[PDB]
């Protein structure tokens, strides 16, 4: 034996939804995790298996996923007898178990709660922090810190603005560490405070989900010119680019795009794909930004490719990829990105997020760790990122301490890892050219 | 021993801010405790040891305390050989090692950051959770689930509006349990933030640092309205009451009060405490309002003590007792105010804060144990509030995790607990009497 109880419960996240967790007992102690929820509900994501009971938390209750592990998956895994440290065979397990193939009977979050659990308990029976176990698993040696992407100014479908971007992030690429790269986040992010009180009231302050900030802006081009405003004037000018979501499958108008389809229907505003792109070609060349994430719709594949063979900085699969490596198998074929946003609830399981990871890595992808707008005090990803030796993530603003305890983890374990910690710097993309 | 190590280092609170958080080392394993930070510091306050180093975090760093800690403190507590069991022998060692009043050595962060490791490895030594702990410390067999009091709507210093006051709480006292309480709070919250977005915009359901909103209001009273609004729209009008911070030192002015404050200096708009005291009759009547934290200046103890003699509701002594002992007494005698509110950092270390709580019990008086407005994912105060009984609880909305960690803690516990698992429900303000 190895598994003497699996254990799940009803906490609430970030935004005060429910969500599961999950607690696993063996003789080394109790090893606990928490699955995050995206806001809107990809159809080519694994399924997150919702009450849907509208007088329970308005529906969001996630009691059957609860009840799902603790009356059939937990007796399961126990009656295997398969170490805590086969990460693998119990993944799959699981998988077969559920039988379909966007887990629809046992819901995403009901798996990947209980696949989380056991990874942080068979790092355990393998005496290795949770980093190091991940990396084995993964076939990595050369641990890296990654670079922090913070997203500061926030924008798009949940977003109060008119802004029709989603998320623009800082990256303190020129950091001499990971702890260093926090300071300079922290710093721009309380300036950029500052600015935005100057120029548009201290009613105008209060954050999102995500810790960042959304002033009553409509011009992308104005949300930049803020981000790097703070930058030049925390003085930090060329140690710290730019990073963006886009998310343009929310604004995606019958084969057009909408800069503000958060105005009264307007299809004469809509713009075409090769526009958009050339507007992107615009941002790089006035501003420090080095990478783009969802450019274009999920299924708009001849703009992503397009747009990727004629641009030299990151493009970042997020809604197009959603961490299943069917689709990261089309878009390496089509050579839609070069970076994988690697969201590992998208998915439903640890295996199978390692799995996405290597298929981008192994086709000269950058990979991205990635938080949910809806997180938990979980710090899963923290070790993630790390053992992957990815090199990059984002997980927030430096504010809110279900951003925060992904960052606070990565400075212990920079802190751990001592002289071997190595930052990927410049690198974010290609951190294997360091390892030495 | 029985400490093996102890170990500091600076991490980042909810605001992005440096605080300190300690490692603890003994035999049974790895001991995490972080510090939470106000966003102001009084002159009775313990002092809170910052940098002030304009190179790094804008002067808000902590390397100093953390080093006091790593150089000073950690050696001499293992040196002792005291045991982890033993917090008020490692509590008091670290007072005479500092030997200052307002702990202004080595730091009041820094001297809580080891206490509470201290006494999560207390905690295991004697094989218990670590409530339970906290429980034998205090003197407590029983142990019973506190009311929370998520604040929803905020104004204050610290907010964007005009709205002078600066928390307004929901308290679900008719839940059938914690758990059931934390679903009815997390309903309203979300009930709200539709009835906001409606009448405000879409641009006003952004959060400020506890996670409630700030709608762009002024009158006091129009708080109130969208609280009950939304509590009757959620269906709870019979089970959650509601709670106030209104924190008067902020807006005290000339020894009147300014309920709009955050607007140019006017002195006609100024009324005084008999002025003041009246509103808060009026809001009483009118609105379910059965607590109010600090309804007047830290130092105006001739309107508290008038103003708690006339009323029936709870009366919380926060910027007026600051969980300072000596001004904790002199609010009993004057009789100030009926309850305490709790911050383990005032005053800096978990013997002298249970200490705190017994004091203002045995005077007759309500304790509620409560976050800072600069948090982190620690959730000691989750069974705190549980190991001293106070029945109470204010950390924040159901909004931001650094405020659900401790929400989440108290529904494993209750959890934990099961059949000896008791609501202080109704009796809040005393669950003595369960
Ligand atoms: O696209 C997104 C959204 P969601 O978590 O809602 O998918 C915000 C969080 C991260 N990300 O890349
Ligand atoms: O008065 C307050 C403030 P701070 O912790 O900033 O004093 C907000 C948090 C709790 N409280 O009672
Ligand atoms: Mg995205
Ligand atoms: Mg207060």
Known sequence: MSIEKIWAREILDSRGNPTVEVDLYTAKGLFRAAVPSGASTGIYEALELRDGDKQRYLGKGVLKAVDHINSTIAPALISSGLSVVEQEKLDNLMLELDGTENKSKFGANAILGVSLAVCKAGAAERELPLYRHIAQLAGNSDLILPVPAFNVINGGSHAGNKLA????????????????????????????????????????????????????????????????????????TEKIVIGMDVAASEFYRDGKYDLDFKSPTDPSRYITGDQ????????????????????FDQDDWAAWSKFTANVGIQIVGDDLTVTNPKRIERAVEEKACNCLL??????????????????????????????????????????????????????????????????????????ELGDEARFAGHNFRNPSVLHH
């Open 276 to 295: 958009l792109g050339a507007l992107y070609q615009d941002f790089v060349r006035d501003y420090p930004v080095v990478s783009i994430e969802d450019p």
């Open 165 to 236: 971007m989603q998320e623009f992030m800082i990256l303190p690429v020129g950091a001499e560490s990971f702890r260093d790269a926090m300071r300079l986040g922290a710093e721009v992010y309380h300036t950029l405070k500052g600015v935005i009180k100057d120029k548009y009231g201290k009613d105008a302050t209060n954050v999102g989900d995500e810790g960042g900030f959304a002033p009553n802006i409509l011009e992308n081009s104005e949300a930049l010119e803020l981000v790097k405003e703070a930058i030049d004037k925390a003085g930090y």
């Open 342 to 415: 690697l969201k590992v609830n998208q998915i439903g399981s640890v295996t199978e997020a390692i799995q996405a990871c290597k298929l981008a890595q192994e086709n000269g992808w950058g990979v991205m760790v990635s938080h949910r707008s809806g997180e938990t005090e979980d710090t899963f990803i923290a070790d993630l990122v790390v053992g992957l030796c990815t090199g990059q993530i984002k997980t927030g603003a430096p504010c809110r301490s279900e951003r925060l305890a992904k960052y606070n983890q990565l400075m212990r374990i920079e802190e």
